[PDB]
Every structure is written in C-alpha cells, then in structure tokens.
C-alpha cells in the first residue's frame, strides 16, 4: 500500500524555478529517504539526489551545479524538489521515489513533466471525428476526437467519463511546426450501437487548467 503522489505537469520560463511535491502514504514517512530522478523525453534515468526524511541529510548530483534543493514536511508527509535557473535542457519527467539501503530506490511517484519554454500555455481545440457510413467497416464503426494545437504536454482523454474503455486508442501527440501539439483518440464501436448510444470525449489539459467534454454524434 505504499504510494507516492506527485503534483501536476508544469510549464516554466527559462530562468524561473520549479518546485515539485510528492505526498507519501502507506508507510511511516520518516522511515525511508526520498530520492529524485529525472528522465528527458525518450531518454534514460538520471539521479538528482536524495534526502533523509528522518535526519535531514542531503546529497545532490554534481552535474546540477548546485541548482537543486530538496526538503520535506513531516506533518503533511510531503517531499519537495526545487530546481532553480531553469533551462530547456531541464525539460524532463521528474520522479520522486522512496530510498533505503536494502531495497534501494523501490517505489516511485507517477512523475511530473516539467517543460521549460518561453512559450505560454495554450489549451486545445477539440473537434469531433464523427461516425458515418464511410467510417464503418462491416459491423464496427470508428469515431473519435481530434485534440488540436495545445501546449505543453500532456493531455488526457477518456470516453463517457471513463465508462467506455474497450476499443479505445489514444494516439501519441505530434509536435507541429508551430510549436503546438495535436493528438487524436479513437473508439471502435458496434455499428448497431450508433443509434441509442452516446459518445463524449473528455479532454483534460491540466497545464492550462482546461477540460473539454465534446459530444461526438453521427453526421
């Protein structure tokens, strides 16, 4: 029942600081250390440092040149990592993880994507990909939603508030020349269901604090 829950993805300007939090549960917070590990998109894991929750000792990776500070709050069972003087080469998923001598770095938070960019947040434009006789192939029909022109990553998509999952595929985003992302989510459904079944895609873009629920209806 060990869980580490991190704060949400963030976009930051070069030269700014970011403070990521990590809430620990399911064990005695002071009984283990907390480490932070970052991962640039598509790349490997890089150790940043660790802190003893119990006694405050810290050790930081030399390659960060002193820009990271780690802290904890025993009262709220939360650990924090602050990275100052950000640059685009700091763009990464930042992970919190529990650390100890025997079990090593054992349980990890879900990760927090920090994008460092001079561009401002932008929420998506969501358009329906409507089912029609042309999107139907022998008993199954495809329908979807197009999530256009947002920044930064990530976006999440569900269907019917999570009730519809079998036959759903959400594609990876592409970074267009404009510096904005686009992605699609598609559901394959029985053609017979097109009447009397409803379909809503629920798009969440936490970086811009935008949620869109888009109804997808036959043409």
């Amino acid at each position: 029942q060990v869980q580490l829950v991190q704060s949400g993805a963030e976009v930051k300007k070069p030269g700014a600081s970011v403070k990521v939090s990590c809430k620990a549960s399911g064990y005695i917070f002071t009984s283990h250390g907390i480490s932070w590990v970052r991962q640039a998109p598509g790349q490997g894991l890089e150790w940043m440092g660790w802190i003893s929750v119990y006694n405050g000792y810290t050790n930081y990776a030399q390659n960060l040149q002193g820009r990271v500070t780690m802290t904890t709050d025993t009262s709220t069972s939360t650990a924090y990592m602050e990275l100052r003087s950000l640059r685009s080469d700091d763009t990464a998923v930042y992970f919190c993880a529990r650390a100890s001598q025997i079990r090593g770095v054992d349980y990890w938070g879900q990760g927090t994507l920090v994008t460092v960019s001079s561009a401002s947040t932008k929420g998506p434009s969501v358009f329906p990909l409507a089912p029609s006789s042309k999107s139907t192939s022998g008993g199954t029909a495809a329908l979807g939603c197009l999530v256009k022109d947002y920044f930064p990553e990530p976006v999440t998509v569900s269907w019917n508030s999570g009730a519809l999952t079998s036959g759903v595929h959400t594609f990876p985003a592409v970074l267009q020349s404009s510096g904005l992302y686009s992605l699609s989510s598609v559901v394959t459904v029985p053609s017979s269901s097109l009447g009397t079944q409803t379909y809503i895609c629920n798009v969440n873009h936490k970086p811009s604090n935008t949620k869109v629920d888009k109804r997808v209806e036959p043409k």
């Binding site: 349980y107 192939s137 197009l146 594609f171």
Partner: protein, 213 residues
C-alpha cells in the same frame, strides 16, 4: 552519462529466456547491491529486483537477477508480449560517480508475433473545424504487426508533400500496433479537389483510403 553499461536492445520469441547484461566496476556492482526496473511507456519505473537477486511483492519468479564480479544480469524467462518495455539496472557506487548509478536502459522486443495488415480509417475535416476556417484530414492506422508503416497523401491522384504529420507506431491494448497521420489543408483546398487519399505501406503492400467533400 550512464555509469553502468547495458545493451540498447534485447529480443526473443515467446517462451524464450532473454538475458540483459549490466556492467560496471568494483566501486558499484562489484561491491554493492544491484537493482532492476521495468518501465512501460508513459509510466514510472517499477522495481523488479532488489539486493542483486530478490523479488519484491508481486514480481513473478520468471524474473531473476544475478551478479558475478563487476557485472550483473537480468533473466526474463517465459518471455511474452507484455514484457516489451525498457529495463534499467542500477547500483550503489562508492566512487565519486556515486552514490547511486544507473545503466542506460535496454529495450526488449518480443518477436514472432502474428503478422497483421493494417486497418485504415480516414476522417474528413469536421464541420466545426471548417467553420473555424481550418481543415485537418485524420488517417488512423490500426491492428497491425510488425510496428512499422509509411504514410503518403494524395490530392486527387497527385502526391501531397506539405502539411503532413505522422506518428511513430505504438502498441494498442491488444498488443497490435496503431499509428496516425494528419494532413493540414485550407477549407478551399479541401473543397476544390474531388478526393484526398491516405496510402499506408506495411510489409511491402499498401492499403489506401479515399474521402471526398
């Protein structure tokens, strides 16, 4: 940057035992515990082995770790499609490179899966997007294996070079692959041609879908 060395890739067919090496030196693997992690796309690493060869809760014993001298090995027995992931080794390190070091990761592929030609669906621009004076054709490619395609676009019969964006295939929930391609056009370009097509090539053969305004 990684202090420990792993092969970039490893592969096998179902039911094979695949091994992944992790090499270092006396200050890390030689003198200290080794750890292994499994990471699926978009997810956090998960501990697979701790203390050289121990399995934590929930890790089945077909995963085994070992170490000898300054190198360690992960053995994935009973290989199966759900094992496709990145695997990382790690160790404590007593040198100036320490206190904790990683390998660079190994991507595991599972070969010998059933071949499958792609299904292609091509969506026209939505009425809503057209009313916002934009137009995107959306070509969705599904249920194929192996996970490699090329996508070409045509306007009537003429190749379209500009305005295309194409994603790398990734796995569906059923372990087959899917990919996507987009063509950005003006509404007048969309309306002024008799049709547009998306042509997908997979394993030497092509599936092409056409849409018309």
């Amino acid at each position: 940057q990684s202090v420990l060395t792993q092969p970039p890739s490893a592969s096998g067919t179902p039911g094979q035992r695949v091994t992944i090496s992790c090499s270092g030196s006396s200050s890390n693997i030689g003198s200290n515990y080794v750890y292994w992690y499994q990471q699926f796309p978009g997810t956090a690493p998960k501990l697979l082995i701790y203390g050289n060869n121990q399995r934590p809760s929930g890790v089945p014993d077909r995963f085994s770790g070992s170490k000898s001298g300054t190198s360690a090995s992960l053995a994935i027995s009973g290989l199966r499609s759900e094992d496709e992931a990145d695997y990382y080794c790690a160790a404590w390190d007593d040198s100036l490179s320490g206190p904790w070091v990683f390998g660079g990761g190994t991507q595991v592929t599972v070969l010998g899966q059933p071949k499958a030609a792609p299904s292609v669906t091509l969506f026209p621009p939505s009425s809503e997007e057209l009313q916002a004076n934009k137009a995107t054709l959306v070509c969705l490619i599904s249920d194929f294996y192996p996970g490699a395609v090329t996508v070409a676009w045509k306007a009537d019969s003429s190749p379209v070079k500009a305005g295309v964006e194409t994603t790398t295939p990734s796995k569906q929930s059923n372990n087959k692959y899917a990919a996507s391609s987009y063509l950005s056009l003006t509404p007048e370009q969309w309306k002024s041609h008799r049709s547009y097509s998306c042509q997908v090539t997979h394993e030497g053969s092509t599936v092409e879908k056409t849409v018309a305004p």
